[PDB]
Tab-separated table of C-alpha atoms in Angstrom:
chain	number	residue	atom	x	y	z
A	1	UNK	CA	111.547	77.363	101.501
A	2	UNK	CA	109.446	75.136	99.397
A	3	UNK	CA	111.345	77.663	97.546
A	4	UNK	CA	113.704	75.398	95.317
A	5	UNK	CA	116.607	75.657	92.911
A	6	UNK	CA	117.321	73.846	89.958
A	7	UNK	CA	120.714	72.069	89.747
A	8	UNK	CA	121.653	74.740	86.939
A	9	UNK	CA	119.741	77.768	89.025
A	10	UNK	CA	122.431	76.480	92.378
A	11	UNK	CA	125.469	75.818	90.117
A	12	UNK	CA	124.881	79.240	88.544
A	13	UNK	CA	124.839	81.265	92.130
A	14	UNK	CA	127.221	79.212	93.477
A	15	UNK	CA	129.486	80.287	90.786
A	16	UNK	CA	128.302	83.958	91.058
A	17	UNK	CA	129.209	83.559	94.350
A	18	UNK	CA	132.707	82.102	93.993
A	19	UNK	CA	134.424	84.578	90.933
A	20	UNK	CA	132.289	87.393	93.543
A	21	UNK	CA	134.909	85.933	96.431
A	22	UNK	CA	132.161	86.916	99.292
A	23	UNK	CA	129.148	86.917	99.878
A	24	UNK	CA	125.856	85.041	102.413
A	25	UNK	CA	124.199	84.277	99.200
A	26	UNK	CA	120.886	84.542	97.422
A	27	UNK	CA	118.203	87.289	97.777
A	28	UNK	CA	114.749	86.519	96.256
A	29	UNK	CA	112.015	89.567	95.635
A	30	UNK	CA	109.495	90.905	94.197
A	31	UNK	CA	108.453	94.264	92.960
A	32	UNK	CA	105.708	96.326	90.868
A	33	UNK	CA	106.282	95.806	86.832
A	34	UNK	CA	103.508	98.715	86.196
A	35	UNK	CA	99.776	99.121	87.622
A	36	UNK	CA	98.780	95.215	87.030
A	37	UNK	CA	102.118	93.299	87.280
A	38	UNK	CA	105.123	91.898	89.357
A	39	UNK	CA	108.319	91.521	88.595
A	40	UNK	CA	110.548	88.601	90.336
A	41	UNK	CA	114.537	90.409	91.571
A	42	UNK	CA	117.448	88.161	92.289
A	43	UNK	CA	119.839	89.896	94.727
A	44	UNK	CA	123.178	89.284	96.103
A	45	UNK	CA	123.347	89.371	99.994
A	46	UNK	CA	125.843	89.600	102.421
A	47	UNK	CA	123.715	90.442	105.636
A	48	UNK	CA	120.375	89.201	106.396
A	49	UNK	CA	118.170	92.094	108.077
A	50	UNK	CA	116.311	90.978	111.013
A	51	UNK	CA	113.080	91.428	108.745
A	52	UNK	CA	114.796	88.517	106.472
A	53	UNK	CA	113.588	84.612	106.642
A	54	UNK	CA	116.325	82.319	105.508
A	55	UNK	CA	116.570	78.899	103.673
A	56	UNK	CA	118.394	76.456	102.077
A	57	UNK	CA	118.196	74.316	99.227
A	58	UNK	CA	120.912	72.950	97.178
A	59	UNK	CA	123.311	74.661	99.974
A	60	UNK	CA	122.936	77.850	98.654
A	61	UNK	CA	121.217	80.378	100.830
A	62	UNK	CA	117.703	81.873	99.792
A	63	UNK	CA	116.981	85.093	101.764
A	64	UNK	CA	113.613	86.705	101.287
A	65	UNK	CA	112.330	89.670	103.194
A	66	UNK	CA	109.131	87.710	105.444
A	67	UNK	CA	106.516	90.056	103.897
A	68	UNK	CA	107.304	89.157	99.997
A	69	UNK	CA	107.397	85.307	101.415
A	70	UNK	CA	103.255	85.230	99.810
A	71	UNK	CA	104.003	85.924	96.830
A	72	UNK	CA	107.363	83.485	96.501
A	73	UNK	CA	106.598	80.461	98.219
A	74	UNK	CA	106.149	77.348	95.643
A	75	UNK	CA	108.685	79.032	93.606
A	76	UNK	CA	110.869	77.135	91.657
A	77	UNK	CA	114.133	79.084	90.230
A	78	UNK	CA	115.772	77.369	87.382
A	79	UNK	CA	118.632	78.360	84.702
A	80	UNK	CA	117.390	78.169	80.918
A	81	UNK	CA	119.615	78.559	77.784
A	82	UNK	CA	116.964	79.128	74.911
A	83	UNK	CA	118.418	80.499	71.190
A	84	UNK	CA	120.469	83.671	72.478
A	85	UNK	CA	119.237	83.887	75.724
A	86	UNK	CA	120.326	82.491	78.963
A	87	UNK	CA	119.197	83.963	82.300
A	88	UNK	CA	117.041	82.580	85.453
A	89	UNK	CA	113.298	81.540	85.064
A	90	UNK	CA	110.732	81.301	87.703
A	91	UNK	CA	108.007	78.431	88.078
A	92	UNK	CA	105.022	78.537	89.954
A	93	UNK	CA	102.964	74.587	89.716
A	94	UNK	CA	100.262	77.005	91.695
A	95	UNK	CA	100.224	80.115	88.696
A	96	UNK	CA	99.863	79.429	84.912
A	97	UNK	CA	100.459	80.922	81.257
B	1	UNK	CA	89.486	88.793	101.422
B	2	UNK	CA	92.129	91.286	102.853
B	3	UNK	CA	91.527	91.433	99.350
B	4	UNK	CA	89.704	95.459	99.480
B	5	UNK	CA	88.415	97.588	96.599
B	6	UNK	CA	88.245	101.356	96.573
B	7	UNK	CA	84.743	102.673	96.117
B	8	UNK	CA	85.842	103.622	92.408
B	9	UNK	CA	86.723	100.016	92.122
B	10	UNK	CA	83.563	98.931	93.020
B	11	UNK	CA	81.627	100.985	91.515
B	12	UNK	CA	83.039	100.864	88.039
B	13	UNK	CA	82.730	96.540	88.568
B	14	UNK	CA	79.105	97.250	89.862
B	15	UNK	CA	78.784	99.726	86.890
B	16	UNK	CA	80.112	96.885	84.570
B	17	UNK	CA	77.990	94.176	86.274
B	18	UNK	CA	74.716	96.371	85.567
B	19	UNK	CA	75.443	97.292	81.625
B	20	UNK	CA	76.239	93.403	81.027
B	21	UNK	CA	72.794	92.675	83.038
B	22	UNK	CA	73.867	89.574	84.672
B	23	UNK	CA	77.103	87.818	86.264
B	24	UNK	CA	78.034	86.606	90.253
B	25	UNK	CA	80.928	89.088	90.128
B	26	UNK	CA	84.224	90.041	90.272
B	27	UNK	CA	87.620	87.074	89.360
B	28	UNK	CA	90.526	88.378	90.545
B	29	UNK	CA	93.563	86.027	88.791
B	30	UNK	CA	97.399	86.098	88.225
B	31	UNK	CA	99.252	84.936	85.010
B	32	UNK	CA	102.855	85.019	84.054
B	33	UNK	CA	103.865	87.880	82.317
B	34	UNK	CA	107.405	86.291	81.035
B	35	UNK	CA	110.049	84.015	82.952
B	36	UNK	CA	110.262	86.698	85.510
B	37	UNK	CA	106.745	88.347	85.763
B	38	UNK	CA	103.579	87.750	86.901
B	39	UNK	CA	100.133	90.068	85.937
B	40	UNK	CA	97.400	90.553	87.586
B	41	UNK	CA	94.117	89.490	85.829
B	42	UNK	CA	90.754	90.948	85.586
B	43	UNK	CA	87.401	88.699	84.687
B	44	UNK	CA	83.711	88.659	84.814
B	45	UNK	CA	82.232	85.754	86.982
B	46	UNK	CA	78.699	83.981	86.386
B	47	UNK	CA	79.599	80.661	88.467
B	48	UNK	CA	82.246	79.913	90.926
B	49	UNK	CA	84.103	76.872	90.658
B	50	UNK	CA	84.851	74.037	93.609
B	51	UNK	CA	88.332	75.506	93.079
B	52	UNK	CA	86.841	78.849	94.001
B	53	UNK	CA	87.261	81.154	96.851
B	54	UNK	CA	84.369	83.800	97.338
B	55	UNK	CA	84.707	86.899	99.511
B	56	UNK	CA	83.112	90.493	99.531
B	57	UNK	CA	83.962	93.956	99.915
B	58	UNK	CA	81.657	97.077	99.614
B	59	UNK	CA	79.190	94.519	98.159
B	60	UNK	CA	80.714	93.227	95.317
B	61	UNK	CA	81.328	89.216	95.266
B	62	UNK	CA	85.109	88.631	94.621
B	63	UNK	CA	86.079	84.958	93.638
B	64	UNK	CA	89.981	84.058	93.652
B	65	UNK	CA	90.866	80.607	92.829
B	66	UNK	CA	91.850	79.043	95.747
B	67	UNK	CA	95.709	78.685	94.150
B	68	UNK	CA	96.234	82.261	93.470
B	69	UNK	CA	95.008	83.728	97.324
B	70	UNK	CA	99.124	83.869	98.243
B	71	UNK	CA	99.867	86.250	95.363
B	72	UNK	CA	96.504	88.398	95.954
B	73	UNK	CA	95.960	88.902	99.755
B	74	UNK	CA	96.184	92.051	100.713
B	75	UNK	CA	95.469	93.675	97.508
B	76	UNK	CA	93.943	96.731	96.940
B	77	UNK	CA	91.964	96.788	93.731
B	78	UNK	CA	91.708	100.467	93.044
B	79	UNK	CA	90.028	102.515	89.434
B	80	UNK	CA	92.474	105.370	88.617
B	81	UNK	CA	92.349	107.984	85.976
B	82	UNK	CA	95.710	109.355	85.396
B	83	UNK	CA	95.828	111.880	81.896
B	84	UNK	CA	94.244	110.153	79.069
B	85	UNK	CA	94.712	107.000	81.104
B	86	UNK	CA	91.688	105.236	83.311
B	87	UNK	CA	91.776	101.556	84.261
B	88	UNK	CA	92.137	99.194	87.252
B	89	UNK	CA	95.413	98.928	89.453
B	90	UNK	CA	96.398	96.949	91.974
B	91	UNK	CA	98.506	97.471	95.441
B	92	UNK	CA	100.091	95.455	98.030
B	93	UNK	CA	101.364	97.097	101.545
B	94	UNK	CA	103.794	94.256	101.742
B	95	UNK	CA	104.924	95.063	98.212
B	96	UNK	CA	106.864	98.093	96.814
B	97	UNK	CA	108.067	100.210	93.738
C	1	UNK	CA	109.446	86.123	111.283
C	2	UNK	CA	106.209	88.543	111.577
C	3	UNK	CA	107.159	86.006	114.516
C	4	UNK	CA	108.313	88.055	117.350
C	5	UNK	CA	109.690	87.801	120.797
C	6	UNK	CA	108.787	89.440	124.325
C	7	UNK	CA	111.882	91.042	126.021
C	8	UNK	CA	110.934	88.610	128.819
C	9	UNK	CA	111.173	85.665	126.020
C	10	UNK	CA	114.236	86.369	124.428
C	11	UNK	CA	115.816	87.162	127.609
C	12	UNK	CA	114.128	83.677	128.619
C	13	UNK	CA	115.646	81.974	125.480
C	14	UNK	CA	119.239	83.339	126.064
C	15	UNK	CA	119.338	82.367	129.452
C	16	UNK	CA	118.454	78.709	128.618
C	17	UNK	CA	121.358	78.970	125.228
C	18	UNK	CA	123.985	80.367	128.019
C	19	UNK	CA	123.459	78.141	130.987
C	20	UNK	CA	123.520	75.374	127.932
C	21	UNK	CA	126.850	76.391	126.370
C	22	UNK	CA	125.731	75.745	122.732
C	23	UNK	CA	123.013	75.985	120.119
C	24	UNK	CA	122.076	78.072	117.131
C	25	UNK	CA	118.546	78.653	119.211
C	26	UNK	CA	114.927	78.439	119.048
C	27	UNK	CA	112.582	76.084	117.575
C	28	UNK	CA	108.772	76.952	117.136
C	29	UNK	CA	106.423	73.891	116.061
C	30	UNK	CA	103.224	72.884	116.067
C	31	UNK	CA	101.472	69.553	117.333
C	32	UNK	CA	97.876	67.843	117.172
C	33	UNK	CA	96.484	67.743	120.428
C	34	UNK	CA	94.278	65.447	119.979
C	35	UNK	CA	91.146	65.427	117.224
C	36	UNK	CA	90.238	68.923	116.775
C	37	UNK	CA	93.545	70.330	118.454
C	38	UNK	CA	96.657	72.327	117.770
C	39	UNK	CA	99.497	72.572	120.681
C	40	UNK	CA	102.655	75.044	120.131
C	41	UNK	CA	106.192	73.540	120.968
C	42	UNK	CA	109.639	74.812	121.798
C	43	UNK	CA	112.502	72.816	121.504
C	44	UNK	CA	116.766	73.651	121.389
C	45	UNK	CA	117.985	73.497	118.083
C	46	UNK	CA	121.775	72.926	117.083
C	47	UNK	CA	121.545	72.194	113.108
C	48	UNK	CA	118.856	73.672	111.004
C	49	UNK	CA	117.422	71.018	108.540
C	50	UNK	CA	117.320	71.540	104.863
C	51	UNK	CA	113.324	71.993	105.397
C	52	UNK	CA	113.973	74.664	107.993
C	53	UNK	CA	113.169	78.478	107.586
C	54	UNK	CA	115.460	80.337	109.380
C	55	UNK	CA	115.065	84.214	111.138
C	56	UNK	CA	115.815	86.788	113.547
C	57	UNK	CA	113.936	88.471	116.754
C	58	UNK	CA	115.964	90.527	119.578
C	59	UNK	CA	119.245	88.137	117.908
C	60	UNK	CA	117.539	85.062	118.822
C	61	UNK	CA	117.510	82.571	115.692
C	62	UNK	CA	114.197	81.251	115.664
C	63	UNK	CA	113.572	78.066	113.533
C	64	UNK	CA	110.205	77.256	112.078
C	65	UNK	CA	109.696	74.259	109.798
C	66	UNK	CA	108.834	75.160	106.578
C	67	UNK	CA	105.630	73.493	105.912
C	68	UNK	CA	104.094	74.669	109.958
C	69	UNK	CA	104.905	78.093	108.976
C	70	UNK	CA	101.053	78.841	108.229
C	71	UNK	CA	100.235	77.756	111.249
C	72	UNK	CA	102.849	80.160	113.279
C	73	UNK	CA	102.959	83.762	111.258
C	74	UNK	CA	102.140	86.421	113.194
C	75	UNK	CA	103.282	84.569	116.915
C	76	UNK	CA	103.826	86.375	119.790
C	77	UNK	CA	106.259	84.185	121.971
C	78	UNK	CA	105.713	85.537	125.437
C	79	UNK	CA	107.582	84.688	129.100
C	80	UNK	CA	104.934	85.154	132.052
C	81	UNK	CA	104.826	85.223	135.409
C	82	UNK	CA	101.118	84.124	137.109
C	83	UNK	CA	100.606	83.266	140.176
C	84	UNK	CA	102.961	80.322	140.893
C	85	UNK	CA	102.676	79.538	137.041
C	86	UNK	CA	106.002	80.825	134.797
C	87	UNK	CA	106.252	79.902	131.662
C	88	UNK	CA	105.901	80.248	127.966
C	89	UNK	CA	102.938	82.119	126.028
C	90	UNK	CA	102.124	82.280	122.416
C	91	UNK	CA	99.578	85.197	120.927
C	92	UNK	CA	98.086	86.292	118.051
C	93	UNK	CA	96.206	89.430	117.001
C	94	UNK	CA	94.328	87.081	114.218
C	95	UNK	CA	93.089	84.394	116.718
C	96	UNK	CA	91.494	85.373	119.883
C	97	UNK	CA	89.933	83.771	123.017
D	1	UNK	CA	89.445	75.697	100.215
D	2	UNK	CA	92.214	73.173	99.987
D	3	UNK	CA	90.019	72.854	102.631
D	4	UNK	CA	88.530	69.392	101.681
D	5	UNK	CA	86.260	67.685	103.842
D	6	UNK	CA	85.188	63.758	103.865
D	7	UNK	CA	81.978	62.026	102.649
D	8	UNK	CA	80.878	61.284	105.775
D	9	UNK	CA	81.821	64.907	107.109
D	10	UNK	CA	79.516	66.655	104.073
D	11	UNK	CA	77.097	63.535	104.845
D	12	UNK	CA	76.716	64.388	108.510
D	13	UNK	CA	76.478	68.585	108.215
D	14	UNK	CA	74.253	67.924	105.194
D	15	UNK	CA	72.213	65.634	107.942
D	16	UNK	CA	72.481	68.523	110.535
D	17	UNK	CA	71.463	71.292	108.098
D	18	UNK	CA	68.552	69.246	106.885
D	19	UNK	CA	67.296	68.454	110.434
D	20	UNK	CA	67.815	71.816	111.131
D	21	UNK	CA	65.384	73.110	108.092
D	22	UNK	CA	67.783	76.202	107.207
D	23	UNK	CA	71.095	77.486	107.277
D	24	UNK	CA	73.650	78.741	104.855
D	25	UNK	CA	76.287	75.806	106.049
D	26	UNK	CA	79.427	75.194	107.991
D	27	UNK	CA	82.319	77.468	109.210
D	28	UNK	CA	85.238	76.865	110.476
D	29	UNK	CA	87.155	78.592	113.348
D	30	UNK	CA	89.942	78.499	115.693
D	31	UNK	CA	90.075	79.159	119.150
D	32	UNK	CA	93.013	79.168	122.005
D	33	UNK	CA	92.794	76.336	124.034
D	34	UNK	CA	95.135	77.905	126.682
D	35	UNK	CA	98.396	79.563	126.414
D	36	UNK	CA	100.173	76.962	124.379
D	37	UNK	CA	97.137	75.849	121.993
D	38	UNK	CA	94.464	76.075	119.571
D	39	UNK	CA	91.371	74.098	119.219
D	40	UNK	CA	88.897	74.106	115.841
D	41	UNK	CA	85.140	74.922	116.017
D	42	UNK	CA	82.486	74.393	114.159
D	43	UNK	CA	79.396	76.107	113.739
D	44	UNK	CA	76.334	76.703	111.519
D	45	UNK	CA	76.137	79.947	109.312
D	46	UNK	CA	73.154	81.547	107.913
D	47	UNK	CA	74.901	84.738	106.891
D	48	UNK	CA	78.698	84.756	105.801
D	49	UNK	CA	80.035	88.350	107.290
D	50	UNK	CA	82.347	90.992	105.157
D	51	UNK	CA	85.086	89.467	106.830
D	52	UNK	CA	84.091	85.825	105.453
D	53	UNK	CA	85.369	83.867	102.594
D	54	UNK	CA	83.341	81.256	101.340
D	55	UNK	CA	84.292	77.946	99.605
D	56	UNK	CA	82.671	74.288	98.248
D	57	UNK	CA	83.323	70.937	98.902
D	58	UNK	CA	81.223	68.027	98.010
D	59	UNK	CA	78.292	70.791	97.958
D	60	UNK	CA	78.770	72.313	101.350
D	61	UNK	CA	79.848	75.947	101.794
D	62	UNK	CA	82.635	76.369	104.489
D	63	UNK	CA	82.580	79.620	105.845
D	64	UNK	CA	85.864	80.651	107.047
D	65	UNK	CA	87.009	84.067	108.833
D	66	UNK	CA	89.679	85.792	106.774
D	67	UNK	CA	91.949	86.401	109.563
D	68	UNK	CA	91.622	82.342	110.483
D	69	UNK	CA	92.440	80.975	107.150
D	70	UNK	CA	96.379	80.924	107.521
D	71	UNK	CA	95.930	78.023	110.446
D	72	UNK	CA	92.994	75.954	108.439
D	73	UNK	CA	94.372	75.828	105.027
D	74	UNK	CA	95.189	72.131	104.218
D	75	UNK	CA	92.774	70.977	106.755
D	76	UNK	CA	90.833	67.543	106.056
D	77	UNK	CA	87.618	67.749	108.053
D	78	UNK	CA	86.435	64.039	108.574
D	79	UNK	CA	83.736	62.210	110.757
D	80	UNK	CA	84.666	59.159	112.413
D	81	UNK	CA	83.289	56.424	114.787
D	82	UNK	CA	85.677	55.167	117.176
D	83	UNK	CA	84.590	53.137	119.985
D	84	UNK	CA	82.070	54.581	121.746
D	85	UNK	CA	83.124	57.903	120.316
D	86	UNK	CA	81.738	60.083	117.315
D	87	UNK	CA	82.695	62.945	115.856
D	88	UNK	CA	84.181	65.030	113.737
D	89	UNK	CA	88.202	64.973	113.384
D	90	UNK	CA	90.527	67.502	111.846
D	91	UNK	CA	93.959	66.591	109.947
D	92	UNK	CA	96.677	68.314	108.118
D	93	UNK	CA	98.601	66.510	105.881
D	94	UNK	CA	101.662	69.310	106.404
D	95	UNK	CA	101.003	69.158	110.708
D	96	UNK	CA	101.988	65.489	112.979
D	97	UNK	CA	101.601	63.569	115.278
């Protein structure tokens, strides 16, 4: 944590979670977009492994695996509708552009 | 630092840094990409900033704004050629794909 | 976690949750000692706070505020026996002394 | 940095760096202080190491270990009179007490 969720980021797993009838909650990751670039992954989870850390904001829980928690922390996810497209959005105050 | 550059690296900033005939060093940044991304950015340094953070490997002066160091420790700035293809890339351990 | 326990520890920690009858388990914090001084603490915890990061070593929850978990990454907790001294130890590879 | 130190912290190791007639500036370290504890150090440089990263306030270059930098982050280095006591004081905003 000082990983957060916007009200629409929470409402919108929470309902993934509910129509899903299961589940622990949120997974949070990162991985390589191509040679000079990461791309953020939203996960379901039902089991935290032992290499997890675990969170809460907005009572929904955030796992992330401890060595991608770097390159997350300060993250804000939020839920955007803009024209056509609707779909989670990560904020860094700390990164730009 | 953790922040480590191959000899290739190094030598083709140093090789850089020569041809230009000037400069401190090496920036390493990060920049969003798009509402789920983040890239890795390359620039030439003449003065760090109070913001600054200044390290060295195989001596080559590497400033990271102070902000970014969670998204770039442990980064290995390496100088591939792959086919017609020759740039910089970067790799994180903790990190995968 | 990249926070671990000792055999001895978690043993240690068990013991004290059993004997107790309840808790969800460990808390590691951090305290000024006084003016250029850091002191580790352990404490029982029964409710992790909305501020709390939550993981697992040797299924013992350990419970790290979020905003002391720079100061505890990479913890050893440790249960030693010296002399007629038992008690808890904390180690890192990164500090020394 | 985000390592910040106070005016009359840069006053007094820009008065011990003048008396002194040389020296590249101040680091920062950390130390245990026994088995449950750390203490911070302080301690001219004249020659930042490999392993060193390097930062500005109030035109004074901290040098910091690499491996250290995860416990000082945040820290306020200030100078204070108190009583019959002076010296230097660390705080942390995120650590109490």
């Amino acid at each position: 944590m000082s990983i957060t969720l916007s009200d629409s980021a929470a409402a919108r797993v929470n309902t993934f979670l509910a129509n899903r009838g299961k589940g622990f909650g949120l997974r949070l990751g990162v991985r390589t977009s191509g040679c000079s670039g990461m791309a953020y992954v939203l996960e379901f989870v039902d089991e935290p492994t032992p290499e997890d850390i675990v969170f809460e904001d907005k009572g929904v829980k955030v796992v992330v695996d401890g060595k991608s928690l770097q390159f997350l922390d300060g993250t804000q996810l939020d839920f955007v509708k803009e024209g056509l497209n609707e779909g989670f959005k990560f904020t860094n105050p700390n990164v730009k552009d």
